[PDB]
Write a protein that binds this ligand. Sequence first.
Ligand code: CLA
Ligand code: CLA
Ligand SMILES: CC1=C(C#C/C(C)=C/C=C/C(C)=C/C=C/C=C(C)/C=C/C=C(\C)C#CC2=C(C)C[C@@H](O)CC2(C)C)C(C)(C)C[C@H](O)C1
Ligand SMILES: CC1=C(C#C/C(C)=C/C=C/C(C)=C/C=C/C=C(C)/C=C/C=C(\C)C#CC2=C(C)C[C@@H](O)CC2(C)C)C(C)(C)C[C@H](O)C1
Ligand SMILES: CCCCCCCCCCCCO[C@H]1O[C@H](CO)[C@@H](O[C@H]2O[C@H](CO)[C@@H](O)[C@H](O)[C@H]2O)[C@H](O)[C@H]1O
Lengths: 180, 171, 42, 160, 153, 180
Amino acid sequence: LYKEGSLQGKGVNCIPIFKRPDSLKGDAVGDMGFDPFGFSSWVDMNYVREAEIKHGRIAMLAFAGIVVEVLGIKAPGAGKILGSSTDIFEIHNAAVEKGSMGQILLWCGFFEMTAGLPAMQQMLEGSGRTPGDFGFDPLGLGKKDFAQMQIKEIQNGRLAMLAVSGMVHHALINGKVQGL
Amino acid sequence: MSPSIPFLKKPDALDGTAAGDIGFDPLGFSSLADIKFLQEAEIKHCRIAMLAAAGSIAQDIFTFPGYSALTGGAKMTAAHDKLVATGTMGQILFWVSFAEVFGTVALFDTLDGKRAPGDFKFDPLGMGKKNMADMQLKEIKNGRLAMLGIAGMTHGYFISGKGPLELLGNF
Amino acid sequence: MDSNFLKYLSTAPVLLTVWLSFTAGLVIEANRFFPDMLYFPM
Amino acid sequence: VAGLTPCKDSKDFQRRLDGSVKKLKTRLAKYEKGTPPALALEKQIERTQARFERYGKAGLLCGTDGLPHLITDGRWSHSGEFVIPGLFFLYIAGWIGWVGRSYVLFARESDKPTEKEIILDVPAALSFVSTGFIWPVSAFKEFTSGNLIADESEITVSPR
Amino acid sequence: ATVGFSGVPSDFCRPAPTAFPAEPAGMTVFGARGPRAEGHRDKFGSRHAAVSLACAALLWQPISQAGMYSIDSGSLAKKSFSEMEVPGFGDAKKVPTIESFFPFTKNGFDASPALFGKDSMIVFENPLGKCGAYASSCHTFLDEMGDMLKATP
Amino acid sequence: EKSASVPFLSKPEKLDGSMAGDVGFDPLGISYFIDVKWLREAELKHGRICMLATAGILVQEVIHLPGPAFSSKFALDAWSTAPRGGMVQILIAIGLIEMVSNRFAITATDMFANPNRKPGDLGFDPLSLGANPATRAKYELSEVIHGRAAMMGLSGMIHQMIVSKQPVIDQLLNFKPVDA
Ligand code: CLA
Ligand code: CLA
Ligand SMILES: CC1=C(C#C/C(C)=C/C=C/C(C)=C/C=C/C=C(C)/C=C/C=C(\C)C#CC2=C(C)C[C@@H](O)CC2(C)C)C(C)(C)C[C@H](O)C1
Ligand SMILES: CC1=C(C#C/C(C)=C/C=C/C(C)=C/C=C/C=C(C)/C=C/C=C(\C)C#CC2=C(C)C[C@@H](O)CC2(C)C)C(C)(C)C[C@H](O)C1
Ligand SMILES: CCCCCCCCCCCCO[C@H]1O[C@H](CO)[C@@H](O[C@H]2O[C@H](CO)[C@@H](O)[C@H](O)[C@H]2O)[C@H](O)[C@H]1O
């Protein structure tokens, strides 16, 4: 683990209010001694870690997409077909109507079925695969410090999850993702 | 691991010796079904789809005299329906079924291990004596591409009412 | 449940009463939903 | 038609229906509308009318008394009157008897047959109850295998 | 005590065999796995069942469209085999034929080489129509849940 | 000592965990008085019939056999509209199938007389998919879980059809909450 004992691992408590559960053994990346409800006792650690990475990645992509939509940056020809609305919910409904979101659903589900489900099943049957590992490093940015990249990915994904949730609810209240 | 899917382990039933075997079986259908049956099915689909795709393109280009009169200018699956009423599709199905009786016999020879999947010993021109493995890889690859292509052509026809080439000329 | 209580419930009069009450309910409900059946319908 | 008239077209049957409905309506005239007695009497009238109509359409024959009569001779036009009902009986009764006999033998080959007959072994009893659904073939199998009929020399009999 | 529904007759004092047949491991498609006579699986195995079924389908293809087809009138005309009259059978000029075994026309079924024909064809009815899971003309279950959550007393 | 499914209740003694889908769920203790072999045979038959029932209710709403008799999207109406002679033929065929598949051993006293007879194993493996020991256990668990899910789904489908008086897909697309 990168910065083991300081950033992550055993004896690390990001929130000293809650005691670092014994189940958190410091073996998993992103282990900062936060599990007040002690889910780690019963859950399947590898499955839940893969779930966390997937949630974070989707949330990061969603943050980028929502920010571009609110800023008004659109691909050539997207405005003519879908519309010029900046509201995320209106964009979602318009794309569902046209068929864009349906195709994205189809292909995301195909990727899930053919890659994520088999990989998850093998990992839970003890393949040894790192959670969230698909070998997708075409640009080779992770060769230098894979562990540092892993921790950065997990933390950025958590922050993106919280930010995306906040943005959606801000849009609900004020009509703005910022919520300023 | 799997050459095609690097992060997934190589399927157990796929040794890699068969033509077109790149370890692509994320869902593990080979672990469910006998791989000889699956290979026979894949080669069959490949050949049928290659003939179907070439037929769609060639029907767009040219139509035999008399068949145009009988089908009234209909194309693709509409030609299918018209010529079913005509009785020509009936003859095609009769003789294809006659072939497929011996196809069933050959399938059980394959499952008994005497026959390689898809090997009907049909090479009158002797094109496979030079490099049979190379030709087999070509056949499998072209057949997969033809399966995808016939899918695309038929669904484009369902969308537009136009054949492959007519669509490409009138997108 | 106590095995002795279960044996008591297995005693003949208890079983006869329960079985015949169940049969009476069966006949009563059959006549409640399909009444006045003097004949098999054919 | 056999010796009587169809009940769907008999003045006696119609008169009986009329009398029943008129009795119910006279009983109803003394109750406020929407009260439980009025609703009950109305439901009684509806049930009477439905019963009479269904009897009429059933193909039942009716005599001069205006009541349906049953032709229990074997005629297939009136099978539902005695034969099919009786086949259902025979099925259920053979079921009951077959399972009871099976339980008697099961208790016979036990440590305390009398205890098993007063305090039952309801798991085995339910087993036999289940078995009882093919009692005809089972009983015939017992008969032909010789496990049903006992020999004359193995059954106690009084002196002559 | 006794555990009921054992399935073992000796537990219930019922007749039973003494030596039960062993279960061989062999399968016939469109058949079952169980005791069989020696050579039964070899003679009447999956190959037998499948090839016999293929032959049956190939024979069904003529049978489904059975009938005297003639082009004497200048167009292909189908006439039931029952129309033909046969000499030498006394009163019965018209005699049973294949239509007796396969009465498709009587039941109003338009058979074809493949089971179904144009007149008698599988019916595909689109369930979706113009409905959508949410924010559609059709009021769906998800629409009901959204309306309920946004409702006003 | 305690059941896995219901922690406060004790583990059912007759459920030793050998059977697929065994989580120690037997609160009423049927296994104590009824042989688990009979219970599992019944469970598998129920689950298989309900798998087919759910598939049929969902499929025969979109695709039908030719004819006015078979043209009914509503399944309870199909029950009545389909040819009665055909339905009786299906009943007779099911009876013959039960007889032959169980090999004349169709009663609680003789069903498992043969030691070779296993709960739910009727000799049905036409394509021999169950001859692989590695996947056999997974297939067994999948079959049991599918039977359970399909049983619940079929019950829900039947009663929601009683209530709504519309097909399942039609109800979900045009939902109308119950009023009296
Ligand atoms: C539509 C196809 C599809 C499929 C097959 C999957 C599959 C999966 N997703 Mg999901 N996912 C999808 C689309 C899909 N996803 C999309 C579009 C998104 C948003 C972009 C996500 C976002 C997402 C996240 C964020 C996470 C998942 C997770 C998972 C995994 C756990 C769920 C599971 O196994 O349920 C299977 C069902 C059960 C175990 C029992 C319930 C049975 C239900 C009622 C029926 C399921 C129906 C099925 C999904 C319909 C499609 C069938 C078709 C493919 C043949 C699994 C690999 C989680 C995970 O653990 O990932 C590693 C996770 O964290 N997904
Ligand atoms: C709702 C109507 C109704 C009711 C309340 C009853 C009530 C009764 N019937 Mg039943 N019965 C009915 C309709 C009805 N019956 C009809 C429609 C028929 C015509 C088929 C019969 C024919 C019938 C017969 C033939 C007998 C009865 C007997 C009885 C009495 C004892 C049954 C018994 O102990 O069963 C529990 C079952 C057993 C104890 C097993 C042995 C007895 C059964 C009936 C044998 C069944 C199978 C056997 C092979 C049939 C051969 C019949 C042949 C010799 C004629 C009981 C009071 C029995 C009786 O009165 O005996 C003195 C009797 O023997 N009934
Ligand atoms: C066996 C044997 C022999 C032989 C032989 C024979 C007869 C061999 C015949 C071989 C044939 C017919 C091969 C056909 C391949 C067709 C393909 C790959 C089609 C792809 C279509 C695509 C990608 C597409 C598409 C498209 C889509 C999707 C939608 C469209 O809108 C657009 C578009 C068109 C682009 C001989 C006689 C030589 C003897 C020898 O001893 C052995
Ligand atoms: C075994 C075997 C073979 C085989 C085989 C076969 C034919 C296998 C077939 C398997 C099938 C048909 C399985 C079907 C499962 C259905 C389920 C679980 C439904 C669940 C529904 C639910 C939860 C629901 C619901 C719902 C309800 C109630 C309320 C609604 O508002 C919503 C909703 C609809 C969601 C073959 C022949 C290949 C041979 C091989 O050698 C051996
Ligand atoms: C193939 C030779 C097998 C010989 C063994 C047959 C033994 C028993 C045959 C019983 C008779 C067949 O049963 C039959 O009765 C029903 C009466 O409603 C018929 O019901 C229907 O049948 C016809 C369509 O198929 C229609 O023209 C009838 O109007 C209709 O009544 C069914 O056609 C069938 O269910």
